[PDB]
Design a protein around this ligand. Structure first.
Ligand SMILES: NCCc1ccc(S(=O)(=O)F)cc1
Ligand SMILES: [Ca+2]
Ligand SMILES: [Ca+2]
Ligand SMILES: [Zn+2]
Length: 262
């Protein structure tokens, strides 16, 4: 029997123009996706190649917008903060009210999700989201997602309109690594590991909508598990976690995030 871990979520919408102040329905549509993907209840799990069917995991995690704020008072679980900032970066400006964002709620009790309109890497590349792995500091724990990649209605735009950027980032929040191993440009692309045996060794990230099989690093004939949530493919193409990843998620829930256990 699976112990279902029920994670209270607070969504911090940080908005400059009015359209960035995304609707309650768009926020709720994202929570709905999380409660499918993290329970193996997404119908598009049928797209997994049959050779890997016995690897698809139910992570046993569910999510809900918080009903009590950190001091025990009634809440919608959504904060809405106007800002003059036009873009945020991986340096975590969105996570402090003093830098034009919104403070985190206590990370031992809530999953903080920040939503903003423009998000860039430190060297200026537009990105869809970023996570903080377990291990503190609490002040910046959580995930950040751009609004055009958040939810399945409202401002969400194809090909990132099925809610999977948040599934992916929450994968990181639960201590999952990119399936391809995050080699640096000068390293052998087959050399690093995501520390999961049942994810095939893989050269690089996959983007877009790859054709099965996509072989790399001598992993033929089945190829890359590019439909894993921890690849970089379009939302409609990533549909599964593996049991090997669930092992790491369970270790995270049992250790550094044990405060979320009942
Ligand atoms: N389903 C979305 C997966 C995903 C997540 C993040 C990115 S990127 O912004 O880092 F380039 C790309 C694709
Ligand atoms: Ca692996
Ligand atoms: Ca690799
Ligand atoms: Zn990632």
């Amino acid at each position: 029997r699976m112990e279902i871990v029920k994670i209270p979520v607070v969504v911090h919408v940080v908005w400059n123009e009015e359209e960035e102040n995304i609707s309650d329905a768009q926020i709720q549509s994202q929570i709905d996706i999380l409660n499918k993907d993290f329970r193996k209840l997404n119908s598009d799990v049928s797209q997994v190649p049959s050779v890997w069917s016995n690897l698809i995991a139910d992570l046993g995690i569910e999510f809900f917008l918080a009903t009590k704020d950190p001091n025990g008072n009634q809440t919608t679980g959504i904060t809405r903060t106007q800002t003059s900032v036009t873009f945020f970066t991986t340096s975590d400006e969105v996570k402090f009210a003093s830098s034009g964002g919104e403070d985190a709620w206590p990370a031992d009790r809530y999953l903080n999700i920040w939503v903003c309109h423009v998000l860039k890497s430190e060297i200026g590349q537009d990105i869809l989201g970023y996570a903080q792995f377990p291990g503190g500091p609490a002040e910046t724990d959580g995930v950040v997602i751009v609004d055009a990649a958040f939810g399945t209605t409202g401002t969400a735009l194809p090909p990132f309109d099925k809610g999977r950027t948040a599934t992916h980032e929450i994968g990181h929040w639960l201590n999952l690594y990119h399936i391809w191993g995050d080699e640096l440009r000068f390293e052998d692309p087959c050399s690093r590991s995501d520390e999961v045996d049942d994810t095939p060794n893989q050269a690089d990230p996959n983007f877009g909508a790859p054709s099965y099989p996509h072989v790399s690093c001598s992993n033929g004939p089945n190829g890359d598990m590019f439909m894993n949530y921890m690849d970089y493919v379009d939302d409609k193409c990533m549909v599964m976690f593996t049991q090997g990843q669930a092992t790491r998620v369970n270790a995270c829930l049992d250790g550094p995030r044990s405060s979320f256990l009942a």
